[PDB]
Structure 1
């Protein structure tokens, strides 16, 4: 069985396929992956905005305008990136609230760096 012995697919296997998980985790445990998705969306929409945005005060306002009017489908990319950031913070706050209500903070290492993940997202947005 190659899924269990290839050094690269081994780490995928032990994280997404054969990973043991509880049988009773509710929808409040869905927000971990939605954070990952939100991040991926903010990478991609973010990246495709950075190909048309300019970083100086004279035309920084105008380059965003240039996206929403002139580049094909850039207005939708831009609102995805703007609203994607807000969805990111919805998921963040559900994620934390899940951890508090159900006591997941007892995973100190996971929790304490989760706090760090909150600060860096705020610094990003």
Structure 2
């Protein structure tokens, strides 16, 4: 089989990101969960760079 399916760590990426079966009819209202994950990355990264200068 393919490496993306055999490796312990990439197997989880493949099953969640690459080969995951999705219904054919989902609309753009199903895209908000992706955005909330980018939001959490924006806040954690911007906050750690400010904490270097905060008292």
Same fold (TM over 0.5): yes
Instruction: Tell me what 2:18 maps to.
Output: 17
Q: Could you say what the CA RMSD is over the residues aligned between the two structures, in angstroms?
A: 0.7
Distance 1:53 1:23 in 2: 48
Distance 1:25 1:49 in 2: 39
Aligned residues: 54
Instruction: Tell me what 1:4 maps to.
Output: 5
- Which structure has greater helix proportion? 1
Alignment of 1:83-98 (within 5 A): none
TM-score for the superposition, normalised by structure 2 = 0.91
Q: Which portions of structure 1, spanning 4 or more consecutive aligned residues, are displaced by more than 6 angstroms?
A: none
Which one has the largest radius of gyration?
Answer: 1
TM-score for the superposition, normalised by structure 1 = 0.42
